């Protein structure tokens, strides 16, 4: 129940934290996936498709971190916490 968020406040932070134990885990959860997406884009030209690109279809020139957050919010990723 709220007006649609716009900018870097989308997706809403509470809905993201609903899926991760704590924000300190969420930051890594998003950063590692952003690195994976960036590596996939870098190797798009030629290379083994070991890193799978974005799951949710990206927008017109959307940053890898934003895509990572959006696909985290869509329940398409799984993470295991160290120690």
């Amino acid at each position: 129940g709220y007006d649609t968020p716009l900018g870097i406040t989308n997706p809403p932070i509470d809905e993201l934290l609903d899926r991760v134990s704590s924000k300190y885990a969420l930051v890594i959860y998003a950063a590692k996936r952003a690195r994976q997406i960036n590596d996939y884009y870098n190797q798009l030209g030629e290379g083994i498709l070991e890193y799978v690109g974005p799951l949710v279809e990206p927008g017109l020139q959307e940053k890898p971190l934003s895509i990572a957050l959006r696909e985290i919010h869509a329940d398409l990723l799984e993470h295991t916490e160290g120690e």
Binding site: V52, E71, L76, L77, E78
Partner: peptide, 9 residues
């Protein structure tokens, strides 16, 4: 997740 990897390809 396995379902996402299957759906994408």
């Amino acid at each position: 997740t396995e379902e996402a990897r299957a759906a994408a390809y």
